[PDB]
Amino acid sequence: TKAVCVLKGDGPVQGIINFEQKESNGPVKVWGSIKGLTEGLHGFHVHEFGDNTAGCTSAGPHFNPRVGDLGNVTADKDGVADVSIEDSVISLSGDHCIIGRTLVVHEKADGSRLACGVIGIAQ
Amino acid sequence: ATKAVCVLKGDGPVQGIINFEQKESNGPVKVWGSIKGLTEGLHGFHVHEFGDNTAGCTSAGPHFNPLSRVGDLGNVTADKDGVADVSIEDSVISLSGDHCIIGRTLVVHEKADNAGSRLACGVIGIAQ
Ligand SMILES: [Zn+2]
Numbered sequence: 632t633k634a635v636c637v638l639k640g641d642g643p644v645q646g647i648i649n650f651e652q653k654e655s656n657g658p659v660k661v662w663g664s665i666k667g668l669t670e671g672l673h674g675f676h677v678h679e680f681g682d683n684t685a686g687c688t689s690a691g692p693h694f695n696p697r698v699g700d701l702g703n704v705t706a707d708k709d710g711v712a713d714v715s716i717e718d719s720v721i722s723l724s725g726d727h728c729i730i731g732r733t734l735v736v737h738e739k740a741d742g743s744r745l746a747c748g749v750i751g752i753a754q
Numbered sequence: 755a756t757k758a759v760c761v762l763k764g765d766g767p768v769q770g771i772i773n774f775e776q777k778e779s780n781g782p783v784k785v786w787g788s789i790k791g792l793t794e795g796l797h798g799f800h801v802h803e804f805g806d807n808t809a810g811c812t813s814a815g816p817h818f819n820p821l822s823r824v825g826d827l828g829n830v831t832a833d834k835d836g837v838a839d840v841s842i843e844d845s846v847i848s849l850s851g852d853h854c855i856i857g858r859t860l861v862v863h864e865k866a867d868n869a870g871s872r873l874a875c876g877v878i879g880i881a882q
């Protein structure tokens with residue numbers, strides 16, 4: 632099972648995040664990159680709703696049937712954060728399924744929602 | 755999920771918000787909302803297989819139609835102001851199960867449904 636998310640915001644923050652889960656009860660691999668960030672730590676969360684009608688504001692609270700807390704990503708001096716996470720709480724199926732929800736990258740370490748996108752099914 | 759929502763955006767002026775509701779599991783899905791920035795007339799309105807916007811609408815993949823068409827919601831009609839008001843009931847798509855469209859892509863096309871180019875699209879997200 633595979634998913635993807637394109638992060639976009641009001642400013643320079645943008646990225647593409649990939650998800651892969653080999654077995655329904657196994658870890659989800661999350662990888663990709665985010666650009667346009669301030670150097671240092673940024674909160675990285677799945678929020679409850681895949682509702683982008685008001686940009687990141689409409690995504691609702693953190694997903695927590697917290698399940699949606701993926702930790703922090705770290706941006707380098709050029710503002711680029713590499714994402715390489717293995718997470719065994721989120722899922723691409725069942726009750727912890729994050730497909731159709733919103734991925735958000737935050738201004739501060741685990742602030743304002745800098746960029747987000749709806750998590751979609753990928754090839 | 756009993757409700758979904760999709761924000762349509764493209765490289766041009768076509769934009770809209772489409773809502774989906776399925777209050778009963780395996781029941782009909784109501785689809786409604788508005789799309790603007792269209793040329794007057796009919797435009798193909800389809801669910802495509804992948805919720806992949808990495809290359810805009812070009813990465814949405816084929817018309818959704820699992821071999822295991824489903825994704826064909828028909829045409830929307832734009833008026834002289836370029837606005838298409840949408841109100842459809844579809845009992846083939848679903849917000850769960852084999853025909854689930856959550857996390858897939860909704861696309862509005864250039865021509866009536868070959869529906870031609872993909873004017874705008876968005877990933878279908880959980881709304882409730
Ligand atoms: Zn958050």
Ligand SMILES: [Zn+2]
Binds near residue numbers: 798799800802869
């Ligand atoms: Zn199509």
